Amino acid sequence: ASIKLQSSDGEIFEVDVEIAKQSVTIKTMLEDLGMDPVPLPNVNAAILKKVIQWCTHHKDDPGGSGTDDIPVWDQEFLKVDQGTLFELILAANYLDIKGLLDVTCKTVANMIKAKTPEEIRKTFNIKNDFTEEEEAQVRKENQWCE
Amino acid sequence: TQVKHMMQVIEPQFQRDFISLLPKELALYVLSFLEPKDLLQAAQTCRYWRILAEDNLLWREKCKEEGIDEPLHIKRRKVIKPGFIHSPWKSAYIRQHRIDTNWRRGELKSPKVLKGHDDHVITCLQFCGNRIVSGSDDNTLKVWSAVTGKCLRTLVGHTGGVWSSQMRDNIIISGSTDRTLKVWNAETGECIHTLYGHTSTVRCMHLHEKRVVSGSRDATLRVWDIETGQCLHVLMGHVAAVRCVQYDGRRVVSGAYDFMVKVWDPETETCLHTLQGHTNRVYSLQFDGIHVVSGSLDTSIRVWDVETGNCIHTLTGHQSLTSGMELKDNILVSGNADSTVKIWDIKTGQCLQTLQGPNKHQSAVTCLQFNKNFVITSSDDGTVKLWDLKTGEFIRNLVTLESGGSGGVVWRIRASNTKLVCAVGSRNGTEETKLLVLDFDVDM
Amino acid sequence: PEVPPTPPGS
């Protein structure tokens, strides 16, 4: 069957019940609270199209989890820019969609492993806000090998 | 609230980065997908990331992964800059990582030298907390401090050479050619009991909880209560000398110069299984409750199932006597007169590594220890070597006796996480007998 | 070739 979601910015989405119920948030508001349509104040139409697209792809992907190797399709699906990834994390959390949260978060982690402090800055922006003294300490305290 | 306190108080406002701007749960969730090497590099990015990366539970989990069980609490503070709230689990990881590093590549500090047993052999060695016990064919044992190198006591009593020993914090047990065992108070040095029953040398023993089992050149074993000093049971059935024994509280396993390994239920003094197959003397033994593993002069090592008595694996490829083996979670490490050490998976029979190569031992291996990272081996070549258990590669000589090729030998070793203890000496006066104790702790 | 120390026989 099909059910109605309302994005934060007022746009309605017709969704297959079994794909939508991957969001525990939606499932709850649907089954326990009987909301029709389901209003999602923290998710606009844009990211909500992407969330539904992801769920639709994994509507059978029986979790399963497999946290280890990030699927090929998902990796292309997040060739997306930094802003969007950030929203996808927030929407996955809001909507409670464990698979999407995990994937998107691993994807950010991967932008960290294993660069040097400096290379992590040139990726994430970040100003070195340490004094001369502090940076001496941090380098010393977080020394790897030697 | 570590993180809450530090954010609210160091005040790292206006960063323009991704993870600074996430809810903090989600920033921590992201950080959870990283290995420690990366966490330590992330921590050097900026104040904010540093505060996040120093989260206590993130590191508790990282520690449980390396099997680090206690957090570590430091003290010298300072209050250096504006306040930082260190994670005990984090500094525990880092402690362990520096210790590891120190064993692999840290400058070799001059070891403490504990001279004793002049002109005699150190036949057994025990190391428990900060106490070392050396036993000798001079008829004595000495108890030493691993911390200071002082000899604390000298256990005189046996009228015969000491050849076996066990220790559990403050109880020491010794076995001698004078045909007895003795139980001792380590702190005071008094002999609390003398155990009669054997008629010939007490060659091996194994202690579990309040009972020791001894094996003897008389071909028997005896099980003894350590508190009462009474001999509970007598195990008769071997035909030649019992050289090696293991006891887990439930079954005794013994190996003898009749080529046999026997499995016993002590309470009923009954031999449940005679494990036959070795075509020569059995010298070494291990047992984990499910598997018995026996080393022979046959050059074979056999693995057996205690429950049925069936040979599961006959592990081959050593060329001479397997003198000592250590077994831990289905990994077996064997040291051999052929100068080689091997590492085996006893579930599969796979020989995972053979320790050799250009820095191989030149002569028989006398002893060994291992953990999930290293093997430590000793030899009559006068070295103690550190090897990488995962790659099987030589790392370095921890000890290199100058007299190594003229008579100096390392008879045996014990190691803690932090310390290595070596019994050393010679049959010709080229190396005075003594223990060497090396420290790999780090300042922390 | 070489075995470890062992107690003297009788």
Numbering used by the authors:
A (entry chain A): 1002 to 1037, 1044 to 1073, 1082 to 1161
B (entry chain B): 2263 to 2706
C (entry chain C): 193 to 202
Paper excerpt:
DISC1 is a vital intracellular scaffold protein that orchestrates neural cell differentiation and signaling, hence the fine control of DISC1 stability/turnover is fundamental for the maintenance of brain function. Here, we demonstrate a novel mechanism for DISC1 turnover. This occurs through the ubiquitin-proteosome system (UPS) and involves a specific interaction between DISC1 and the E3 ubiquitin ligase, FBXW7, an F-box protein component of the cullin-RING ubiquitin E3 ligase superfamilies. The F-box proteins recruit specific substrates to the RING E3 core through their variable carboxy-terminal protein-interaction domains.
Thus, specific interaction of DISC1 with the Skp1-FBXW7 complex requires simultaneous phosphorylation at Thr198 and Ser202 within the DISC1 PD motif. As anticipated, residues 193–202 of the DISC1 peptide bind to the narrow face of the FBXW7 WD40 domain extending from blades 6/7 at one side of the surface, across the central channel, to blades 2/3 at the other side. The central five-residue segment (Pro196, Pro197, pThr198, Pro199 and Pro200) of DISC1 adopts a twisted U-shaped-backbone conformation to enable dipping of the pThr198 phosphate group into the β-propeller channel. As a result, the peptide chain does not enter the beta-propeller channel and stays on top of the blades, thereby facilitating pThr198 recognition by FBXW7. The pThr198 phosphate group tucks into a positively charged pocket at the inner rim of the FBXW7 β-propeller channel and makes charge-stabilized hydrogen bonds with the guanidinium groups of Arg465, Arg479 and Arg505, as well as the hydroxyl group of Tyr519 from blades three and four. The side chain of pSer202 is oriented so as to allow its phosphate group to make hydrogen bonds with the hydroxyl group of Ser462, the backbone amide of Thr363 and the guanidinium groups of Arg441 and Arg479 on top of blades two and three. The pyrrolidine ring of Pro199 fits into a sandwich-like structure formed by the side chains of Trp425 and Arg479, while the backbone carbonyl groups of Pro199 and Pro200 hydrogen bond with the Arg479 side chain. Pro196 and Pro197 engage in van der Waals interactions with Val383, Val671 and Trp673 of WD40 repeats 1 and 8, whereas Pro193, Glu194 and Val195 interact with Leu559, Leu583, Ala599 and Ala626 of WD40 repeats 5, 6 and 7.
